Amino acid sequence: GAQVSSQKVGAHESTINYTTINYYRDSASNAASKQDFSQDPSKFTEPIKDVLIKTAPMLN
Amino acid sequence: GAQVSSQKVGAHESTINYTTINYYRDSASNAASKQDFSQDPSKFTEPIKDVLIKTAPMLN
Amino acid sequence: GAQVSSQKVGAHESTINYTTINYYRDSASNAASKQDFSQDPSKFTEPIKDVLIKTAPMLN
Amino acid sequence: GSSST
Amino acid sequence: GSSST
Amino acid sequence: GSSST
Amino acid sequence: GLPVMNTPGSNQYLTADNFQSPCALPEFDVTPPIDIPGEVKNMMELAEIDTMIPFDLSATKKNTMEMYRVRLSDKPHTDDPILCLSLSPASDPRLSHTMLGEILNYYTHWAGSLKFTFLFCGSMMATGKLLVSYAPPGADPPKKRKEAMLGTHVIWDIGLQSSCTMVVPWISNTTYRQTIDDSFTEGGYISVFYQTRIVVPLSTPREMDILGFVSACNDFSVRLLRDTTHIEQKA
Amino acid sequence: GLPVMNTPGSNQYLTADNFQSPCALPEFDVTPPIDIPGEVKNMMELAEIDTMIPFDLSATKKNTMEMYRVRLSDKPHTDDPILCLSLSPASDPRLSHTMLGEILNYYTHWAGSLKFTFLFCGSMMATGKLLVSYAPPGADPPKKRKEAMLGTHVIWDIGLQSSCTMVVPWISNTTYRQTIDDSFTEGGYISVFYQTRIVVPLSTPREMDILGFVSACNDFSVRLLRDTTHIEQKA
Amino acid sequence: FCGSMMATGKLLVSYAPPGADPPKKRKEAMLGTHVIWDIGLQSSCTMVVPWISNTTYRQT
Amino acid sequence: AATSRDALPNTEASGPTHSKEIPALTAVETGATNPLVPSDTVQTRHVVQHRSRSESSIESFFARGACVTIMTVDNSASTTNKDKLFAVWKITYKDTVQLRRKLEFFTYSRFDMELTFVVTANFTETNNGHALNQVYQIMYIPPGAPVPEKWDDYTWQTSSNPSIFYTYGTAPARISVPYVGISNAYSHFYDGFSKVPLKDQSAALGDSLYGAASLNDFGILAVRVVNDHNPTKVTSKIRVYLKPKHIRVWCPRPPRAVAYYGPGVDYKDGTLTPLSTKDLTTY
Amino acid sequence: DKLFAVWKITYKDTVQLRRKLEFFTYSRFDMELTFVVTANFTETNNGHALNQVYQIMYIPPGAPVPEKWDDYTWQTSSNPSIFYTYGTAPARISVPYVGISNAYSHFYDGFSKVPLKDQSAALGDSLYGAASLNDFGILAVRVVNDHNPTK
Amino acid sequence: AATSRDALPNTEASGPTHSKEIPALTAVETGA
Amino acid sequence: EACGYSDRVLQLTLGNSTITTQEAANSVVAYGRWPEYLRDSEANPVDQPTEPDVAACRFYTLDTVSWTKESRGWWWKLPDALRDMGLFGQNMYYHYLGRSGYTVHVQCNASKFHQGALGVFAVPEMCLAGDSNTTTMHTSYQNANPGEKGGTFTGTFTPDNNQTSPARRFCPVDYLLGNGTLLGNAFVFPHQIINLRTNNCATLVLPYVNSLSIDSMVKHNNWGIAILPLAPLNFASESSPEIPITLTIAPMCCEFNGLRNITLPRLQ
Ligand SMILES: CCCCCCCCCCCCC/C=C\[C@H](O)[C@H](N)CO
Ligand SMILES: CCCCCCCCCCCCC/C=C\[C@H](O)[C@H](N)CO
């Protein structure tokens, strides 16, 4: 049940990895993976009904 | 001898798993798996000799 | 995710090995491997534009 | 070795 | 056994 | 699983 | 030794933990199970069994057999309530001590549909139509048939099928309700009224009892285990 | 038992650690998520939204609605600044309280390009050309159009497209700047000037406001998490 | 609209099918069939009174 | 598939321009922010961007334990006008301010809760008399379960409530809690009441606090020294640290700008001037 | 007041590591910090103390520095802190390469400000060889325990 | 094979009714 | 479009109602989510919902307010502002539970010689601050819920000192957005600006937003509409200009659960 993932290596001395094993039945007991996703800001930065083309006049 | 099972993941950050190894000879020493079964209430809720059809008159 | 490397065995009692597993996501948390490289001193000892041939006159 | 439930 | 991400 | 250097 | 680093939580005793521990009686010859009738696998099975409601907790009737009896009579039609009850299964005093209520007091949260079944115990010669109501929360609690009709209800015709069931469907804002009186997670109102009236012929008792029962439906669940307030140990 | 040897760090509690720990409520029935609108995945998404700058923090205008209003008028052309601001997004008082500024105060280091957008709020009949400038650090901060012209700038013609944006490109010696006033990691100078002048016809207001907004570009990032100075709890 | 180009305005044009108090305040008229007219370059605005009747034909 | 630790976009080289394309002109009335990058308004070089947003992911932004309360207990002889001190705390993140402000950048959240307990003790009186090592019981009492009235009453049996028996001088205690909300997310703001005031009802009877939903949202921690008392007095404090693991957040909000004044969004007179003096044309 | 300590992180307060690092002009490395903690009684009274817990808070440049052993900053919602228990193993944490440059400069032949002519001398002044004033921030340490009768 | 952590049954949509099927009428004397 | 279509000229039609505009600045869909009915996978009350469709999902026009040089700002809550609007209000008070999305259309025209700018913000859970410095969280239901008249912002915090009979109302200070956070940051909420030289309206399409799939509409407001003068009204050289502001709002995809007798709230 071991999970093997790669570290993003910052200062250096191939891919360096690290190992994780969950010891408990409840996912709440688990540490945070920090393997998170990003998304585009659009729902907050461009919430307009008609798609904005930045080279175009915003008002037409 | 490792046993690998899945967690039912509640709040989220594929299947997340956890590992279990028994360290002792006596099953009494083991933790509880919590991998339990359910059953129908019938032996307590419908203990009657003739099967009940709920749309039908209970007395006929 | 285990990493297996060889020891350089000094005093003796085949290759003897040792095992390493990274426990953390951040490479900064890792121990030092000591598996380091060497380089030639030239950039400090022979920084001259024209390659030196030691049997030859250094000035010609 | 390993059991998987 | 092992997962590799 | 295992790396061997 | 293998290099290890002690983390927070080390050496604590959490009463809810789930760890292995050494056996004090190694190789003990355990007695096998036998197939004893009545095995239970989940507390909600017990919640699904009908148990009887102590509806009439008046000063003289409470803590006596009388608290279970709801008295009806053959009086002329009225739009006034036979009974009024809050849908607070773990905390309303009439529900909290039923088997459902009791199990709910070991948990913090409940959810799902419920059902109330009434049993008519008058004579065979007694006839009648009653209205059983459930008003989801948020308005004036029903005190007249007029209001109670507008909510979830069953009109019960008394006859050979002695009993009648009204299902209180899960209708809630939150995904789980609290097992205490709480306005945010309030459940609303159960009430019973005369639809027509109880009618008897001569030589017949003019008054009788109905009995009421509550149980959970198959979509009913509880969570967050807790100690109950229904038992204590002073000194 | 397995031979083990306790290492330094054993039994400490680092508030930034990331370990497993026993669950106090085993087998709890968790409520599922629902698709709530507006989910955020990274604080820099909020940094990319335009929020309005409190440019005029004069003694009478600060902590009032007026601090957001930059007053222009139709006076004859001058080479004197409408406004002057330091590119210190987390510490200059006019930037530090914007949403960008606020998020930056939870981090020690920032990097990347920024953009300032100005909104003209005079009447339709009002016309004008302005010069918006960014002078990277190291020289005399611009106080006259003459100097500001020599740096990064946009000449804004006022018209139907109400607003105009000047991008402050990431131009720095260090790979990340500090989120405090620091000479080594100074960012330089934002300023705005009249290019021609505001011209209005008769029957028109001769004075008006422009509003300004700041937000981060897609190449913008922060690092080294820290507590902010923008909130406290005395006693 | 026959005012000058400089004149602006928003009007509400209403149709209330029969049977209630005839509208005398915007409050009532809003609740029926209506068009909110913004005055501008498109000089005119149309409200369609849809056929809404109990009988198949009305009397003249 | 773009991850939090991926590098941000490269700057692409760009040259002179003279066209009808107008990136720089825009209109904020629309409600949108102009998505510009430096190559839209200046000449750029090609840069290979290595920087990432890894440390500002929602998880990384919150991945720290924060103090949310300090509980005081003692181990003294209970005597007719004063009993042995045990502590009771209603679980909340609003008694302190720093974690509260971070959470309130958002309207709603989901997370697993990690609670760490740091325990410290001291002697309060001069006598040279000693104490032996204390064990502490931290009992979680969920809404509805009986709250202890005395340090030693029946509720400390904990047959169903989770308790931690912590030994003094050992590693700080730690437990995890799942997302336990009765809603699909935790509400950092609730614009409403828990009761509707009805007309046929008295005002008192229909009344409730603005912005409060369940009265006892999450229950109580009750802490006691399990030891019997010493001749000498020892006082202890239990500092509680909360970390939100496995977190999700929705609907961003402007951060708290003036001092907190209670559990709601209320503010106090005298605290309403966060901004300092600075002249418009002064750098 | 009760004494808490504040230290500006540096390798230049002692001499041996400084001399080794200074064989070179620039460096990159991950930092391992180990903390050894020792206590003693200072006055004669036979009165005792109970086991102390220490809080080592890292305050990065910009975060509020504590003015009192017990003020709001010790909440640490975002700053990393170590709660160390007396008599346990010495505490230890790691730090990545956190420099704002591509390498740490052991020597910086320059100033953090250019003195301009149109500016006063005071206004353009800065220390020779110093770059960021608070290069790496502060460690603030306190005894978390309330006080004993004995010191 | 149904486990303790399995989800409970879905509510199925259902419409108006007018029949001889009488779910609501019953008889608790039976013990059920 | 070469057939005339413009970002500035729109027609909106819901039920028996149409809005036209010739000076829009596009329209906003909050968080990019259009309103929807509650899906089976997210459902919670099991009874058949009531969905009034065109009977309630239509444009209702509130009482027009007036913008002047002294205006500090206005606020409304949803669904509260619509509680007395035709069959939407009826459906709302007859049921325990209700959910709804909205098209909010703010209207304000003037002339090419006027100037001024209104920030129009839709805030999820717009909790506002109270008038007391002796008590917190004490704004009464009646004062929290003005119905269609809405409330207003003030430039000054002024604490209620009558402790005998407290006012129990909000005291929402404009630069603090009425909630202790700075107005300049309100732009992270879905918004538009009515800048009189540019546009004469704002249109916000709001999804149902909540930590629940459905809730008590009578106890809880999901959205707040805050309108504040970002740049003040001005015209020619008149000392006292005035222009009207009208709100027209339409419920969208609303559904109700838990039918009983009608709620009769204590509103005064
Ligand atoms: C033995 C220790 C057990 C400790 C158990 C704690 C269980 C309770 C968890 C409480 C969850 C609190 C979440 C934070 C606050 C809420 O987000 C907001 N005020 C709104 O819901
Ligand atoms: C809870 C403990 C956290 C401790 C965090 C320490 C973070 C700061 C690391 C400082 C890096 C110092 C590097 C050494 C010095 C520099 O090389 C030179 N003076 C020039 O840059």
Ligand SMILES: *C(=O)CCCCCCCCCCCCC
């Ligand atoms: C998957 O995990 C199979 C491999 C097992 C590797 C060794 C596990 C190390 C000890 C874990 C003990 C179990 C924790 C409850």
Ligand SMILES: *C(=O)CCCCCCCCCCCCC
């Ligand atoms: C099955 O268990 C084969 C794999 C062994 C995995 C490593 C076991 C970890 C240490 C267990 C020690 C034995 C406990 C008595």
Ligand SMILES: *C(=O)CCCCCCCCCCCCC
């Ligand atoms: C690669 O690592 C696969 C083999 C796993 C071997 C056992 C790992 C021993 C325990 C590591 C625990 C995880 C540390 C976070």
